[PDB]
Amino acid sequence: EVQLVESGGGLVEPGGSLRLSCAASGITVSSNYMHWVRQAPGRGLEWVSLIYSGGSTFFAESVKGRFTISRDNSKNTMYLQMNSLRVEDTAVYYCAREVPRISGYDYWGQGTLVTVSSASTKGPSVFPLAPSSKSTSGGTAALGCLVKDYFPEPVTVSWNSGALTSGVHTFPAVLQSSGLYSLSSVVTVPSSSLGTQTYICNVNHKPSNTKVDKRVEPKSC
Amino acid sequence: QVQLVESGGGLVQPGGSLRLSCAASGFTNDFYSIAWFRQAPGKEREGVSWLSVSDNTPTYVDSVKDRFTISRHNANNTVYLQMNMLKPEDTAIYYCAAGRFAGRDTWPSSYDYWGQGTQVTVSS
Amino acid sequence: DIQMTQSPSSLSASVGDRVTITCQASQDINKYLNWYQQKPGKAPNLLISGASNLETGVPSRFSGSGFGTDFTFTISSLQPEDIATYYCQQSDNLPPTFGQGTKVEIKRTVAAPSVFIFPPSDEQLKSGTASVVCLLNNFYPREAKVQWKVDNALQSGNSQESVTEQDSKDSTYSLSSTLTLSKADYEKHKVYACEVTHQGLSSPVTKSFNRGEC
Amino acid sequence: TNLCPFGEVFNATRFASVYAWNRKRISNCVADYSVLYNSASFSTFKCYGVSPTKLNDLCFTNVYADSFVIRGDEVRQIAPGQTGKIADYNYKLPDDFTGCVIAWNSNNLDSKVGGNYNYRYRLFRKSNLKPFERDISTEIYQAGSKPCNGVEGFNCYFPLQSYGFQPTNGVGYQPYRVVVLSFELL
Ligand SMILES: *[C@@H]1O[C@H](CO)[C@@H](O)[C@H](O)[C@H]1NC(C)=O
Numbered sequence: 001e002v003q004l005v006e007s008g009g010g011l012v013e014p015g016g017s018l019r020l021s022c023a024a025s026g027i028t029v030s031s032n033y034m035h036w037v038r039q040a041p042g043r044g045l046e047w048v049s050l051i052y053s054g055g056s057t058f059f060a061e062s063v064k065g066r067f068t069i070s071r072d073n074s075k076n077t078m079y080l081q082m083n084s085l086r087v088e089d090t091a092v093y094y095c096a097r098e099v100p101r102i103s104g105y106d107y108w109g110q111g112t113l114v115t116v117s118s119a120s121t122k123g124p125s126v127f128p129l130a131p132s133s134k135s136t137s138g139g140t141a142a143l144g145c146l147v148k149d150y151f152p153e154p155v156t157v158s159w160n161s162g163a164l165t166s167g168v169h170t171f172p173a174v175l176q177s178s179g180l181y182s183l184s185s186v187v188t189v190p191s192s193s194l195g196t197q198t199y200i201c202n203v204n205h206k207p208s209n210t211k212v213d214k215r216v217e218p219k220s221c
Numbered sequence: 222q223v224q225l226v227e228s229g230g231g232l233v234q235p236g237g238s239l240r241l242s243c244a245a246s247g248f249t250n251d252f253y254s255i256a257w258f259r260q261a262p263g264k265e266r267e268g269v270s271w272l273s274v275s276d277n278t279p280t281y282v283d284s285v286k287d288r289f290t291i292s293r294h295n296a297n298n299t300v301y302l303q304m305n306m307l308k309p310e311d312t313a314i315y316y317c318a319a320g321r322f323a324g325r326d327t328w329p330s331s332y333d334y335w336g337q338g339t340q341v342t343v344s345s
Numbered sequence: 346d347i348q349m350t351q352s353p354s355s356l357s358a359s360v361g362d363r364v365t366i367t368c369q370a371s372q373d374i375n376k377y378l379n380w381y382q383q384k385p386g387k388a389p390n391l392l393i394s395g396a397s398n399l400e401t402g403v404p405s406r407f408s409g410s411g412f413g414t415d416f417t418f419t420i421s422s423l424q425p426e427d428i429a430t431y432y433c434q435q436s437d438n439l440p441p442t443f444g445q446g447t448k449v450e451i452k453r454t455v456a457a458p459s460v461f462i463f464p465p466s467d468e469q470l471k472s473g474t475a476s477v478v479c480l481l482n483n484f485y486p487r488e489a490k491v492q493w494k495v496d497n498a499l500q501s502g503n504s505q506e507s508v509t510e511q512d513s514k515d516s517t518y519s520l521s522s523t524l525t526l527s528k529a530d531y532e533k534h535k536v537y538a539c540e541v542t543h544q545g546l547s548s549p550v551t552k553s554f555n556r557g558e559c
Numbered sequence: 560t561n562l563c564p565f566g567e568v569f570n571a572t573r574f575a576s577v578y579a580w581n582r583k584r585i586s587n588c589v590a591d592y593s594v595l596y597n598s599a600s601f602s603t604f605k606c607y608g609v610s611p612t613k614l615n616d617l618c619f620t621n622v623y624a625d626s627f628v629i630r631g632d633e634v635r636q637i638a639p640g641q642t643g644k645i646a647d648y649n650y651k652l653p654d655d656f657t658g659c660v661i662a663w664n665s666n667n668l669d670s671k672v673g674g675n676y677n678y679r680y681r682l683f684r685k686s687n688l689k690p691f692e693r694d695i696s697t698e699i700y701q702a703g704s705k706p707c708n709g710v711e712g713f714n715c716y717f718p719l720q721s722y723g724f725q726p727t728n729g730v731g732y733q734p735y736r737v738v739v740l741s742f743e744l745l
Contacts, residue, residue, distance in 0.1 A: 002703070020497065027714070031685060031702050035441075045381075045432055045443045054687040056642035060440055067493065094388060099702070101682060101720055104379035104394035106401075111388060128464040129478055134552060135461045142461045146469070146476055146523075169482070171507040171521045183507070183519050184478055218462040252610075276612035288680060322638075324596070324605040324659065331605065331634045373729030401713075413729065438632075 002107060003022045004095050009123060011152045011207060016085055020112055021097030021172030022078040027107060030073045033098040034045035035105060036080050038091035038114075047091070049080065063089070085116045085188045119179050123210035124150035129186060130219040136191045140167075143194075143216045144186030146202035149178070150208070157185040164189075194218050199201040222335045223247035225317055230339030233307055239341065241302040243317035248298075251275045254320050256332060257291065257298045259313035259341070266316065271325035272300055280325050284310075308342045314338040347372050349434050351444030359452040364420040368433035368444045371414075377437035378416045380409055381460065382429045385510045395420065421472060428511050450487075453516040455485075457545030458484035462552040463530065475531035477550065479539035481520040487511075490542035491522040494553075497532045500524060531556065561589040565595070568624045569661075574669070574736050576648045578681040579695045580627040587620055591709070592594035593660070601736075603634055603662035607737045611659060619742040623689075625650070628678045630670055630722060638741065648681040650739075653690035653718050658741035665729060669724050671732035677722035678734065683718045691741075 004027065004161055008020040011220045022029065022036075036048040050058045059067055063082075070079040078095060092111040099106060131142035136142075157170050170185040187200060195218070203212045229241040243255060258272040270291040271280040279291045290303040302318065318332035326332070348371040358364050367418050368378065380393035393409035396416055406421045420427060430450055431446035458481040465475035483490055487508065493500035505526040511518055522539060538553030563585050575581035592614035596604055605707060609617060629637070630643055635647040639656045645725045646652070652660075683700035696718070699707040704712030710716055 002508065012350070028701075028702050028703055030698075044446045045434070047385075047441045052644075052647060053683070054647045056647050057688070058439060062468070068509075092718075095403070096434070097718070101377070102395070102716070103398070104391045104400065104436065105381075105389075105434075106391045106394075108390075109618075125469070125472065127469045127476070132467065134554065137459045137461070137462065142480060142482065144463075144478075144480075146468075146478065169509050169519045171519070172507060174505045174507050176505065176525070176597055182476075182523065184480075184523065186480060188482065206449035207459075216376045247573055254605075268697045272607075273611060276610035278593075280597065283599065310677075311715075320605070322607055323610045325603075326605055326634075327602040328631075328634055330632075331638075374729060375728065375732045379670075 004097065004107050004109035006093060006095055006112035008062075009093060010112040011117065011119075012085055013118055014085060014087060014116055016116075017081070017083040018085060018114065020080040020114070022109060024076050024078075024079070024097075024112045025207060027097050030071050033100055034078050035096045035098055036069075037094045037096055037105075038089075038106075040088075040091040043091075046091070050098075050187045052060070055143065067193045070183065082114070085114075087116050088108060090114060113153060115192075115209055117152065119151050121208050122149065122151050122180060123205050123208035124148060124155060124203060124212070126201070126212045126214045128214060128216040129184060130216060131189075131191075132193050139191055140188045141191040141194055142186050142188045144184050144201055145158045145203065145214050145216065146187065147163040147203050149176075149180040149209050150205050152179050152207055153181060155181075155183065156204045156206075157183075159185075159187055160198075160200055161202055164199070223319065225319060225336035227317055227336035227339055230315065230341045232342045232344075232345050235307065235343055237307050237343075239304045239307060239342075241304065241315060241317075241339065243300040243302075243336065244301070245298050245319060248253065248319075252321075252323055254322055254324050255291075255293075256318045256320075256325060257302050258316045258318060258329065258338075259311070260316065260338070261313040263289055264313070266329045268325070268327050270302055273323045288297045291321060309343050311341065312343050313341060315341050327337075346440055347438045347442055349433055349435055349442055349444040351433055351447055353447060354445060355448040355450070356451050357452050359462045360423055361515055362423050364423050364449065366418040366431060366433075367416065368411075368416045370415055370435055370454040372433045373413050374438060376412050377435060378409070378411065379436055380407075380418045380435065381419070381432045381436045382427075383432065384429045385496070420449075420464050423449070423451065425516060428513060428516075429450075448451070449513050451505060451516040453485050455545045456483065456517055458482055458489065458520070458541060458543055459525045460539070460541050460550050463552060464537070464554055470528055470531070472508060473528045475526050475528055477524040477537050479524070479538075479541075481513065481522075481541060481543075482515040483512075483519060484543060484545060485517045486544060487518045488544070489520060490521070492540040492542070493522070493524045494536075494538045494540060494551075496536050498521075507521045560589050561619055563568065563590040564589060565624070566625055566650075568738055571626070572658075574628045574665075574678075576677075576679045577627040577629050577645060578679060578693075580625050580650050580693060582693075583624040583626070585617070585622045587622070589615070591615075601663050603660060603737075605638065605640055606659040608655070608657035609659075609670060614659070617742055617744070619744045623741045623743075625741070627738070628665065628722075628734050628736055630724075630731065631664070631682070631733050631735050633717040634685045634735055637737055638660070642681065644682060647687045648684040649688070651688040651690045651692060652671050652739070656690075656741065660738060661738045661740070662735050664730070666724075666726060666728075666733040668734070669727065671724070672726060673723045678722045679719045679723065681718055681723065682720045683716055685687065686727055701723045710731060
């Protein structure tokens, strides 16, 4: 299968350095025009760099002199070495293969998130959003988990270990005034199952090795 | 370091004259070339006169051929552009550029050293 | 550098409508303009290359045209799976640059939101903080107003909203508003309420609870 | 003594494609190199390691006139120390080049309505050319892990591509004729 996979993105302090990888399958990294393209949160795409199969490299003016490109042909991998990182370098970084002139950037990886910040890692607290009558409408009831106060992005949330996918809304995180992200993940289920079905959210914050299972029951008073 | 100090612009009437100057500093040797570009309102940078220093040879475009004169004084390391019989077409922002070669080029991407140009306006 | 001017920055069209997106280059770029689709959280997908090449596997409702400085991207018949942000990109002039993007949403009939409110959990109150969540589920259009009231005092500057991307199936949105106070502050007041104003609501809907009550 | 056959080079009716760049080897002949530099026909005239007017006062044996067609925004690559598709994969000058790069717009000759596609360049190559190397091979370029077996397809591209010279192209995409004079200095 033809694939690009980026890794290595994470939290780094301003003025620090970090190395990203772009591991390919099917495409031979060292035989192709390979690009790095980044996207700041909520912003548009911005080209970062390019390496020719023959080794010539080109870099955007914002990163010129701080970024370099390496290739490991035996691992079919391209590396982006990032030095003297700035806050405004914070983005999702993609690698992409271009077939110039006759095609476009036809393969991209899923992206890897780089966060340049002085803030330290903190794992989330997970709190139930209990279902109730005030959560019940039209035969359905809403319940969820409040994934509060974590840094950096991202978290992942599933319900009943993936068995419950229909009706799940995991809202995009928002950065609170404290500098910590917060998010809710809610699911609407039939009210008939509130007293008889078990609902558990599975929260995973890999930057802090925090895995939390939280059971969400209706509130008794 | 390489730096192009530029001056001599101003407002003039049609038919008048104006003497531009480009003072180069930071060249180890005389092996470099000076060019004069002008950027009309909305138009691109366009060379009009050239001077390879190491052989002291000028070159001009046909439009300014008998009206402009480019020369160099070796004492102060300054290139001059004598613009006689100025016309309203000559109204542009004039730049001087330098490249690490002996010769001339019409492509701006061949010169790595520029001066932030002086304004030249010709009207009545 | 070459600046790409992409218009409009966002548009809203019904299913089956024709969508036209322009991209204009600051300098001549011959035919070397590409078009991409990006769904939220996903990598971009190449749709058009070389101004008009329909790329491998891309549905024939996508097309592009143009040469020199003026280029056009068309979706001949907008589909629900087309909800995305679209970008042009000039490829053959260093540095390769992108348009600002065009966010494409889908017009559908008006749908009022279901509003639910969640008091803080006992777990959180033991930590010294109270978060009250107000949930607006499956509505259209996206514009909605959530006003928090605390003993009928309007709350400003201690809440935050988050909206989901438009659903690929029913073309609706969902919104969460979270009101955060300290435990001591939360114990000062009795009635916590969110008041929702939305086009599908003839009059604003209020969901509320009293602190310390079933 | 005898004057160099520079007319056969500059005024040649047809020019080579840059990947198959033509080279003319001329003995130590005499030529008014000062008149060449002052010819208004030449929009690009850049010399390295030597001044245009002092070319006759050089100690060398053979002079080479390499010549070919590229597009206008590619003329910057015909110079010592450059990178890009032309300098990397088509025509490479050494860092210590001694000689001159001459170029001029040939839109009136090498462009055709509906496009002239006769001129080509190498778009894919595994490694960079050495200075003054010429590669005219046409093996299918393998961009992936599967062998092509002489069949073009996905990840299997013909290594040469045509320029598309139309009269109405912007000047960066118009054809330019290039002559490079180098000197076998003693
Ligand atoms: C090319 O031909 C023109 C016209 O016949 C002539 O003036 C010019 O000198 C020739 N160039 C060379 C290098 O011989």
